[PDB]
RNA sequence: ACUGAACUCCUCACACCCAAUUGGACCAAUCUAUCACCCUAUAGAAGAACUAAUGUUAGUAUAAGUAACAUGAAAACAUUCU
């Protein structure tokens, strides 16, 4: 629902542009369904800022649309299994534990393919340059 | 009934299309690299078994879509509407290339197919028409040919100039309709199922299946007209601009059956000829 | 002017007089203020006349809001869906009575120019004139100067 | 003579939206089969011409360095040679202009 | 009325026209390739051809020497005209120059032309090439040619 | 800035009116708008129609099955009008058949059936219910009320009237609110037919009469783009009906329609319905 | 001033149902305060109205007017933002649905005349607006045929009533 | 003979077609008193109402994209030439 007022308190400012920038001017239909394995803490470290790495293996649904309401990412009905390593940060007096950064391992499987095709231009050539 | 034959062939064709698209689910992203001289190195992240060289041209620009008529996919000519199957290198072939031999062959093949559709839908119901084959004739020959066996009732009838002009008028009606050239690489079993009534097409499908290491047979459809081709075709009938069914010649061995060869000539929009040059080409194609 | 105004043809709602007469006014809504001289006449109308009008017009549901927005008003809703809003600001009791009776008597059709003072669905009983009425026929239907 | 009346926007639109005043659509624009650039049929491809002009400017800078001064036009022919090229038997007795780049594909 | 008038009106008058063409021609002889407004190039092309003819007339020809002296404002080009350009075209009889239209000048949108002396050492201009003989129309015409040759 | 408030407020009111005209709010059922009392409205419904309904029957008539289903679904987080609508539909069809057969004894059963279908169709009943305010009192799950639901509720109201006051009063109601819907209507505007000439030939065979001879009675400008033809159908040299047209075929077809109207007694100048 | 054209890109439609035709993408772009007469810009805008993006770019690349280059830059920017931000699959699958020029904020200068008199020169500025719609350019309106003309005339003839009578 | 007015009649309703001038009935907006407290009322006031002064100021038109204006040539942008 683009509840940015609550999102500011829910996630860290380091994470907020990632949360709300690319999702601007498009409706997302993210929904949650029962998790697969219980969440557990992984490790914690430390003017002073807290940090907690938590591993989750849940099941989620995504459906990202356009300005015009046409689907461009993910089926809305079929759920997917998500493995995430979410790192929380806390302020150390009134702050709480907010999503700071999601760690994506290099061995993580590739994400869902996108509906539309894409063209990737080659290196542009100046008049004095030749393609090699 | 000819209408029943067309309906059943279309139903089988659509059944095969649905079966193949279902067999290819999801969206697998293949990588196709433009290997042509212009816009070199551009990579299209296309959808496997859905995206086409037409889609790649659309990504490039509108000039590519308008002028590009064949696709060398990894060096092999590909119909512009033939869904791509794997990551590969693509090059678009136009009529005005340095050596447009493959494009010329494809244009001749597609013009012959259009002629075949016109012949099938021209004659009256009483007379029966069997399109035996479209012989692969060189462009230098001056005409594209389609061989057909007509009803024995017409074993002496020869089309008049008005009949030929009516044939050309029907061909121009197809051109105005601007029907895309749908393609399918099907199994010989399904091809024989589609063309079971036509013995000539049955044996031609058998020849093509034998030639190919597998039982893959190319089936082409303009609209409601399915036929077996010897290679890739042009995208749309609207590519043809000047089109004329020039003449009909009965082949020498008339004793088994009367194989009448419909000879015509055509030129695309990109290569329009002046009126006088076109008339001379018509005269040459009437032979 | 007529040219700068919409027009319609004379009509009823559902052939309102053929079988039976149905009063087309179905709802009256008086928004009246407790205080405020603008609705003094409306208050007196509610005190002295709205009950008699209601019992004279059993087919009209009358609402009295006693808390208006802007000026005191009477909103008349008709069967055909028309809504006519009339301000009863600074109107006397008799003025409001006449206005309400006019709303009760009229139909919901737009008060715009009416093209014709009459409306027939059967303008002709003997057959509408055409050029061949009153024209005699000729033997074998021969047109003038026809040889045969 | 001064105008007798203000001209209305209706009259003015009828005048200045006439087809005689509208910009005509050009139908001689095509694509250079060489490089795929837009060109008019009778006019040189702008991008190809810019390429040729830049190379000519470099060659002429080298020519100026070789000549070293005004009024020094050689009375002998000139040949441009790129890296990895040697004067031919025909190129003998012709002043050599050496270019530091490699031979362009469009140059021959 | 200008029926049959073959010369443009350029510069500030007749002398100015001649001087403008002379400067363009001197530039053409020096650089062997010149950009200039299309009309001025078209006017100067005839003088370029006539200069090559005068150079062919010979170094020792007094009339040719006087013509070259007038028409080349930089005198180091006269030996060039007589010992490079004319020998380059001794075999030819005409068409020593190549004139092509160029995209309009960005300054004033002027119609522009490039004029060069054929056979220069500069990179070749992107000449217009006819359609390949292997195109569909050309192949059909080749078939016509072969049939006509065989029949008649 | 100019001191004052009244002009600014007037401008705000005009802006609000223009905004309502440009982007009118989605239609909302009258029940959800202010000044609504369902009991008073349903009483005034009967008093308007000058009929003594029984309030329970009318309330049941106005409530649909879909409304009950939606109400139960909402309650998760009443007697429908089905039988009343069935009774009303059956009685209305039979009484309309009686009316039409008494008025036009020469009309065939197919014609009477088509007329009754027109008079009880979704379009006619929808129009009548909308202008009788049935839609306002209708309890449905979606708004605006679809014509099928509106027709069902209207016939439920007719059935409620039947149970409350009787067949005679219900017949008067049907005469007043459905029979009047054919006033000004043309026979074949209500009963769509194909091949009126063939249908006329069938009727003449039923009457043991030979097929009529189509014959050109009058014509004008035959060779122009605006011809007028009058074609008359003759039964044994006797004119039964003539009709105009642009082409001879159209004129003949229209003459067939005129002959059918005359045979069925549904001519334009027939005796008007008695009320 | 008004800046509604910029805001027209920020409207988000509700997601479409599966049984609903795909809504074509619409991209609004503008250049404000172009040193050019809006009357001169109008001809270029009118020229490229209704054409595909590639056809418009080709036409503008060979037009001598100063505004042609500006409109070409605006169209290229609109194409780029159409691909990047408005989820347009193909660059070339766009046509100019709207192209207009508007008056900009202009500056007044003095033009000296010959007898101590003067005029007020206006340093004219113009805006330029485009809407690009995804898809092939809509076909041009076919010319009226004789059959269509005759049909319209006969409809008018049939529409006649007997006026000012019962 | 008919046609033929704002004359006259007919159905209904009525203060509702002269300049200057004069009598009268109303009245927009504003402020104030007191209300209303919703956008009005009763009064008291007054910088109290603009299709017109070659009116003043500002905006933008029309004439008009018109009149008019401007940069000698090539080039290696070094330079050379006229
Ligand atoms: Mg001059
Ligand atoms: Mg009179
Ligand atoms: Mg009088
Ligand atoms: Mg004043
Ligand atoms: Mg004013
Ligand atoms: Mg004034
Ligand atoms: Mg202007
Ligand atoms: Mg003028
Ligand atoms: Mg001038
Ligand atoms: Zn090029």
Swiss-Prot record, chain C:
Keyword annotations for this protein, in alphabetical order, are: Mitochondrion, Ribonucleoprotein, Ribosomal protein, Transit peptide
Q: Give the UniProt record's GO annotations in the biological process aspect.
A: mitochondrial translation; translation
Record GO cellular component, one term: mitochondrial ribosome
Q: Keyword Cell division on this protein? A: no
Q: In which tissues is it expressed?
A: High relative levels in skeletal muscle and testis. Lower levels of expression in the heart, brain, placenta, lung, liver, kidney, pancreas, spleen, thymus, prostate, ovary, small intestine, colon and leukocytes. Expression is coregulated with TWNK.
The entry's localization annotation reads: Mitochondrion
Give the GO molecular function terms: RNA binding; structural constituent of ribosome
Quaternary structure (record):
Component of the mitochondrial large ribosomal subunit (mt-LSU). Mature mammalian 55S mitochondrial ribosomes consist of a small (28S) and a large (39S) subunit. The 28S small subunit contains a 12S ribosomal RNA (12S mt-rRNA) and 30 different proteins. The 39S large subunit contains a 16S rRNA (16S mt-rRNA), a copy of mitochondrial valine transfer RNA (mt-tRNA(Val)), which plays an integral structural role, and 52 different proteins.
- Record family assignment: Belongs to the mitochondrion-specific ribosomal protein mL43 family.
Protein name (Swiss-Prot/TrEMBL): Large ribosomal subunit protein mL43
Recorded source organism is Homo sapiens (Human)
Chain's gene name: MRPL43
Curated annotation (Swiss-Prot), chain D:
* Keywords of the record: Mitochondrion, Ribonucleoprotein, Ribosomal protein, Transit peptide
Q: How is it modified after translation?
A: MRPL32 precursor is processed by the m-AAA protease (composed of AFG3L2 and SPG7), which cleaves the N-terminal transit peptide. Cleavage by the m-AAA protease takes place prior to assembly into the large subunit, an essential step for mitochondrial ribosome (mitoribosome) assembly. Proper processing by the m-AAA protease is dependent on the zinc-binding region within the tightly folded C-terminal domain of MRPL32: zinc-dependent folding halts degradation initiated from the N-terminus and triggers the release of mature MRPL32.
Q: Which domain of life is it from?
A: Eukaryota
Q: Which GO terms describe its molecular function?
A: RNA binding; structural constituent of ribosome
Q: What ranges does the record list as Basic and acidic residues composition bias?
A: 91-103
Q: Which cellular component, as a GO term, is one annotated location?
A: mitochondrial inner membrane
GO process terms (BP): mitochondrial translation; translation
The entry's Zn(2+)-binding residues are 32, 35, 45, 48
UniProt-annotated stretches for the region Disordered: 86-108
User: Where does the record place it?
Assistant: Mitochondrion
Q: How does it assemble?
A: Component of the mitochondrial large ribosomal subunit (mt-LSU). Mature mammalian 55S mitochondrial ribosomes consist of a small (28S) and a large (39S) subunit. The 28S small subunit contains a 12S ribosomal RNA (12S mt-rRNA) and 30 different proteins. The 39S large subunit contains a 16S rRNA (16S mt-rRNA), a copy of mitochondrial valine transfer RNA (mt-tRNA(Val)), which plays an integral structural role, and 52 different proteins. bL32m has a zinc binding site.
Q: Corresponding gene? A: MRPL32
From Swiss-Prot, chain F:
The UniProt keyword set, sorted, is: Disease variant, Endonuclease, Hydrolase, Mitochondrion, Nuclease, Primary mitochondrial disease, Ribonucleoprotein, Ribosomal protein, RNA-binding, Transit peptide
Q: Which SUPFAM superfamilies match?
A: dsRNA-binding domain-like, RNase III domain-like
**Which gene carries the instructions for this protein?**
MRPL44
Q: Which family does it belong to?
A: Belongs to the ribonuclease III family. Mitochondrion-specific ribosomal protein mL44 subfamily.
Q: How does it assemble?
A: Component of the mitochondrial large ribosomal subunit (mt-LSU). Mature mammalian 55S mitochondrial ribosomes consist of a small (28S) and a large (39S) subunit. The 28S small subunit contains a 12S ribosomal RNA (12S mt-rRNA) and 30 different proteins. The 39S large subunit contains a 16S rRNA (16S mt-rRNA), a copy of mitochondrial valine transfer RNA (mt-tRNA(Val)), which plays an integral structural role, and 52 different proteins.
User: What Pfam families does the database record attribute to this sequence?
Assistant: DSRM_MRPL44, RM44_endonuclase
A GO term for molecular function: double-stranded RNA binding
Q: Where is the DRBM domain?
A: 195-265
**Broad enzyme group:** hydrolase
Q: So what EC number does this one have?
A: 3.1.26.-
Q: What's the protein here called?
A: Large ribosomal subunit protein mL44
**UniProt lineage:** Eukaryota, Metazoa, Chordata, Craniata, Vertebrata
Against InterPro entries, the record matches this protein to: dsRBD_dom, Ribosomal_mL44_DSRM_metazoa, RM44_endonuclase, RNase_III_sf
Q: Which disease is it linked to?
A: Combined oxidative phosphorylation deficiency 16: An autosomal recessive, mitochondrial disorder characterized by hypertrophic cardiomyopathy, liver steatosis, and decreased levels of mitochondrial complexes I and IV in heart and skeletal muscle.
From Swiss-Prot, chain G:
Source taxon at top rank = Eukaryota
What family is this protein classified in? Belongs to the universal ribosomal protein uL22 family.
Biological process (GO), any one: mitochondrial translation
Question: What is any one of the record's Gene Ontology cellular component terms?
Answer: mitochondrial large ribosomal subunit
Protein name per the record: Large ribosomal subunit protein uL22m
Molecular-function annotations in GO: RNA binding; structural constituent of ribosome
Where it sits in the cell: the answer is: Mitochondrion
Where does the UniProt entry say this protein principally localizes?
mitochondrion
Presence of keyword Ribosomal protein: yes
List keywords of the entry alphabetically. Mitochondrion, Ribonucleoprotein, Ribosomal protein, Transit peptide
Subunit structure, interactors included: Component of the mitochondrial large ribosomal subunit (mt-LSU). Mature mammalian 55S mitochondrial ribosomes consist of a small (28S) and a large (39S) subunit. The 28S small subunit contains a 12S ribosomal RNA (12S mt-rRNA) and 30 different proteins. The 39S large subunit contains a 16S rRNA (16S mt-rRNA), a copy of mitochondrial valine transfer RNA (mt-tRNA(Val)), which plays an integral structural role, and 52 different proteins.
């Amino acid at each position: 629902n683009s509840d940015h007022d609550r999102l500011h308190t829910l996630v860290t400012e380091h994470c907020f542009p990632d949360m709300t920038w690319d999702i601007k001017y498009k409706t997302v239909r993210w929904s949650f369904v029962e998790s697969l394995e219980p969440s557990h803490v992984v490790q914690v470290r430390c003017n002073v800022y807290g940090q907690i790495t938590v591993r989750m293996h849940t099941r989620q649904t995504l459906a990202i649309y356009d300005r015009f309401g046409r689907l461009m990412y993910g089926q809305e009905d079929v759920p997917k299994d998500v493995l995430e390593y979410v790192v929380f940060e806390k302020q150390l007096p009134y702050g709480s534990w907010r999503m700071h950064t999601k760690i994506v391992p290099p061995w993580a499987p590739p994400k869902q393919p996108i509906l539309k095709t894409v063209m990737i231009p080659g290196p542009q050539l100046k008049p004095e340059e030749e393609y090699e | 009934s000819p209408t029943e034959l067309t309906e059943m062939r279309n139903d089988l064709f659509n059944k095969e299309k649905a079966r193949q698209l279902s067999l290819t689910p999801r969206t697998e992203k293949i990588e196709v690299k433009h290997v042509g001289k212009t816009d070199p190195g551009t990579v299209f992240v296309m959808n496997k078994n859905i995206s086409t060289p037409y889609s790649c041209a659309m990504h490039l620009s509108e000039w590519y879509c308008r002028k590009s008529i064949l696709a060398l996919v990894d060096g092999q000519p590909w119909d512009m509407y033939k869904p791509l199957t794997k990551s590969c290198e693509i090059k678009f072939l136009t009529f005005k290339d340095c050596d447009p031999g493959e494009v010329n062959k494809a244009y001749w093949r597609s013009c012959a197919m259009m002629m075949g559709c016109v012949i099938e839908r021209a004659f009256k119901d009483e007379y029966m028409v069997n399109l035996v084959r479209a012989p692969e004739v060189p462009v230098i020959s001056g005409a594209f040919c389609y061989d057909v066996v007509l009803d024995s009732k017409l074993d002496e009838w020869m089309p008049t100039k008005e009949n030929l002009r009516s044939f050309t008028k029907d061909a121009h009606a197809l051109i105005y309709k601007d029907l895309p050239f749908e393609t399918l690489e099907v199994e010989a079993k399904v091809a024989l199922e589609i063309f079971q009534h036509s013995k000539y097409k049955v044996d031609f499908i058998e020849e093509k299946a034998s030639q190919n290491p597998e039982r893959i047979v190319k089936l082409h459809r303009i609209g409601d007209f399915i036929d077996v081709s010897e290679g890739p075709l042009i995208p749309r009938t609207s590519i043809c601009f000047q089109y004329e069914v020039s003449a009909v010649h009965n082949l020498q061995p008339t004793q088994p059956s009367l194989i009448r060869r419909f000879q015509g000539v055509s030129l695309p929009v990109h290569l329009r000829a002046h009126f006088t040059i076109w008339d001379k080409l018509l005269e040459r194609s009437r032979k | 002017t007529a040219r700068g105004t919409p027009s319609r043809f004379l009509a009823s709602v559902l052939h309102n007089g053929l079988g039976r007469y149905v009063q087309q006014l179905q709802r009256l809504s008086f928004s009246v203020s407790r205080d405020g001289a603008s609705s003094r006449g409306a208050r007196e109308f509610v005190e002295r006349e709205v009950i008699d009008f209601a019992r004279r017009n059993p087919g009209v549901v009358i609402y009295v809001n006693s808390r208006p927005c802007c000026v005191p008003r009477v909103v008349a809703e008709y069967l055909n869906g028309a809504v006519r809003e009339e301000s009863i600001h600074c109107k006397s009791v008799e003025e409001i009575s006449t206005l309400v009776q006019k709303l009760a008597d009229q139909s919901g059709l737009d008060v715009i120019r009416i093209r014709k003072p009459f409306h027939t669905d059967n303008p002709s009983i003997q057959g509408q004139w055409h050029p061949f009425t009153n024209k005699p026929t000729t033997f074998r239907g021969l047109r003038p100067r026809e040889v045969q | 003579a001064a105008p007798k009346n203000r001209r209305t926007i209706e009259v003015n639109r009828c005048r200045r939206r006439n087809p005689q005043k509208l910009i005509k659509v050009k139908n001689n624009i095509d694509v250079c089969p060489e490089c795929g650039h837009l060109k008019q049929k009778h006019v040189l491809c702008a991008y190809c011409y810019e390429k040729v002009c830049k190379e000519t400017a470099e060659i002429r800078r080298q020519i100026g360095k070789q000549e070293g001064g005004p009024f020094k036009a050689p009375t002998i022919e000139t040949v441009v040679l790129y890296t990895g090229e040697t004067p031919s038997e025909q190129d003998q007795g012709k002043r050599i202009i050496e270019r530091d780049r490699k031979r362009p594909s469009w140059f021959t | 009325i200008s029926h049959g008038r073959v010369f443009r009106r350029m510069g500030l008058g007749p002398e100015s026209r001649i001087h403008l063409l002379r400067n363009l021609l001197t530039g053409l002889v020096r650089h062997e390739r010149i950009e200039a407004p299309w009309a001025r190039v078209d006017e100067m092309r005839g003088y370029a051809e006539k200069l090559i003819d005068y150079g062919k007339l010979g170094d020792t020809n007094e009339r040719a020497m006087r013509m070259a002296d007038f028409w080349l404002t930089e005198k180091d080009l006269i030996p060039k005209l007589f010992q490079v350009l004319a020998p380059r075209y001794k075999d030819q009889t005409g068409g020593y120059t190549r004139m092509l239209q160029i995209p309009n000048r960005s300054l004033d949108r002027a119609k522009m032309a490039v004029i060069e002396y054929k056979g220069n050492c500069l990179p070749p201009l992107p000449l217009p090439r006819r359609d390949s003989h292997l195109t569909l129309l050309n192949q059909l015409l080749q078939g016509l040619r072969q049939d006509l040759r065989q029949s008649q | 800035v100019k001191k004052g408030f009244r002009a600014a407020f007037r401008f705000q009111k005009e802006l609000e009116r223009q905004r309502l005209l440009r982007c009118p709010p989605p239609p909302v059922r009258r029940s959800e708008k202010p000044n609504w009392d369902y009991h008073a409205e349903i009483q005034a419904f009967g008093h308007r129609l000058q009929e003594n309904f029984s309030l329970d029957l009318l309330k049941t008539a106005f409530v649909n099955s879909c409304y009950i289903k939606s109400e139960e679904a909402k309650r998760q987080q009443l007697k429908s009008n089905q039988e009343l609508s069935e009774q009303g539909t059956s009685f209305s069809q039979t009484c309309l058949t009686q009316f039409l057969e008494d008025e036009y004894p020469d009309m065939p059963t197919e014609g009477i059936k088509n007329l009754v279908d027109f008079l009880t169709g979704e379009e006619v009943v929808c129009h009548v219910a909308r202008n009788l305010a049935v839609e306002q009192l209708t309890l449905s799950e979606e708004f605006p009320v679809p014509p099928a639901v509106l027709q069902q509720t209207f016939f439920a109201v007719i059935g409620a009237l039947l149970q409350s006051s009787g067949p005679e009063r219900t017949a008067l109601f049907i005469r007043d609110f459905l029979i009047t819907q054919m006033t000004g209507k043309e026979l074949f505007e209500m009963w769509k037919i194909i091949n009126p000439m063939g249908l006329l030939v069938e009727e003449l065979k039923k009457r043991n009469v030979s097929a009529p001879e189509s014959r050109l009675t009058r014509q004008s400008g035959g060779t122009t783009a605006l011809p007028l033809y009058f074609v008359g159908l003759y039964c044994d040299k006797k004119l039964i009906a003539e009709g105009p047209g642009e082409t001879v075929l159209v004129a003949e077809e229209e003459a067939a329609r005129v002959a059918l109207r005359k045979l069925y007694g549904f001519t334009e100048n027939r005796r008007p319905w008695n009320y | 001033i008004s800046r509604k054209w910029e805001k027209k890109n920020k409207i988000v439609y509700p997601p479409q149902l599966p049984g609903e035709p795909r809504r074509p993408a619409e991209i609004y772009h503008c250049r404000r305060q172009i040193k050019y007469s809006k009357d001169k810009m109008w001809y270029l805008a009118k020229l490229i109205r209704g054409m595909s993006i590639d056809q418009a770019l080709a036409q503008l690349e060979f037009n001598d007017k100063k505004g042609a280059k500006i409109i070409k830059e605006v169209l290229l920017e609109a194409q780029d933002m159409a691909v990047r931000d408005h989820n347009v699959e193909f660059r070339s699958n766009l046509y100019i649905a709207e192209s207009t020029s508007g008056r900009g904020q202009c500056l007044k200068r003095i033009r000296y005349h010959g007898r101590g008199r003067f005029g007020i020169m206006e340093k004219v500025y113009c805006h330029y607006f485009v809407k690009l719609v995804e898809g092939p350019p809509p076909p041009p309106e076919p010319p009226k045929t004789a059959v269509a003309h005759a049909k319209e005339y006969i409809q008018q003839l049939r529409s006649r009533t007997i006026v000012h009578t019962l």
